[PDB]
Amino acid sequence: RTKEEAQETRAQIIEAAERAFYKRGVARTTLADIAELAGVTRGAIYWHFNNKAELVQALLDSLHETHDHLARASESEDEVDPLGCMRKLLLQVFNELVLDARTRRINEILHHKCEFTDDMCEIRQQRQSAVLDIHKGWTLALANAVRRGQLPGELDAERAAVALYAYVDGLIRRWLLLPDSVDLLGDVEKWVDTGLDMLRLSPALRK
Amino acid sequence: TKEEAQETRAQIIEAAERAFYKRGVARTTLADIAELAGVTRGAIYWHFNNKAELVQALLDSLHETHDHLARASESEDEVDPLGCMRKLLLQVFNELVLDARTRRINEILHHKCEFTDDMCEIRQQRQSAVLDIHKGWTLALANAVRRGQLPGELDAERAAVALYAYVDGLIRRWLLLPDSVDLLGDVEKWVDTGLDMLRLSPALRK
Ligand SMILES: [Mg+2]
Ligand SMILES: [Mg+2]
């Protein structure tokens, strides 16, 4: 069928884009390069994607799927243990980064093999949107945890969400750069609780 | 003469910041930078063997302003090593927000510089630079432990990693979304939030 064959083609393109961007970077890779790696025609790849920026976004967008269940739970005001949902969420983020070759490779592309240039302004714009989306969700989950007595009552939820994101994002990039400097999988619980401890203990994050 | 060459080097590095910031590192060549700087007859290749050496020069330049406080925090004779670390981090954030050159170089290194194994040196040099920072921060935190400023059972190495993750992440976050985080007005609070992680989290203790 048309759709089944089209989904298969799009999937081949995306897998080849991961391979191309990881080895040679986003800047110098072309859609024609990716089509040759995927074994599809140039008419096919350009039918699925208009430019490289759309292929980068497809990889970026693919990262949230695994975590959607725990994210929504943490953000629900009816959830009785919102902080516990955040802890399970962060454990899953790190566990997937270490174990999944795809998650690791996409993260490496976004962090270390993809430049922000006004020649391709959409890459930076869409990164801004993704990070703001995460911020909005984490601010809600932290406020819920405050409401349930799991975090300090005077916590600045917004600054707390920024502090947590900084730590998590910085540890991901540090592990990608020096994977042997950090036993992210074996000590994963310790790395998660270090971040949460910052939020629930530091008086600098309170109003 | 000696000053002619030191001037020419500075002209090149300043043009490299302009070229890398506009077009990124991957697609910028030493030839492009030379024309942008206006230095002729192959002079740029006298100063830099390749583009990765130029990139390292930009990164190396970030350590200069903080060297006094970094060396102090690491000295065994320093009686206030954690206070040195606080002053170090305050200055890092103050310079990042206030200094156009520091901000632009950080944006280049964080957001406009690909690691490609055709240019394997860029990644390798970044690894060595972050390992150097980690060695120094581990020593400064160990000094703070010795001086009773941090918990005796602190895992100095993991604490240095945790602090770096936070600082590095906060810099990148501010570069991406500067209007979200008043890094300058609230600088003391952003610093103390990270230091509080080390002072208070039982998860960083051995
Ligand atoms: Mg996933
Ligand atoms: Mg400086």
Author numbering:
A (entry chain B): 5 to 211
B (entry chain A): 6 to 211
From the paper:
We chose TtgR, a ligand-inducible aTF belonging to the diverse TetR-like protein family, as a target for computational engineering of ligand specificity. TtgR is a 1-component transcriptional system and represents the simplest molecular mechanism for converting biophysical interaction between inducer and protein into a complex biological response like transcription. TtgR is a compact, dimeric, all-helical transcription factor with a large cavity between five angled helices forming the ligand-binding pocket.
From the enriched population, we isolated a resveratrol-specific TtgR variant with four mutations: C137I, I141W, M167L, and F168Y which we will henceforth refer to as the ‘quadruple mutant’. All four mutations were in close proximity to the ligand and no mutations were found elsewhere on TtgR. The four mutations do not substantially change the volume of the pocket (215Å3 in wild type compared to 234 Å3 in the quadruple mutant) or the surface area of the pocket (184 Å in wild type compared to 186 Å in the quadruple mutant). The four mutations localize to one face of the binding pocket, making nonpolar interactions with the ligand.
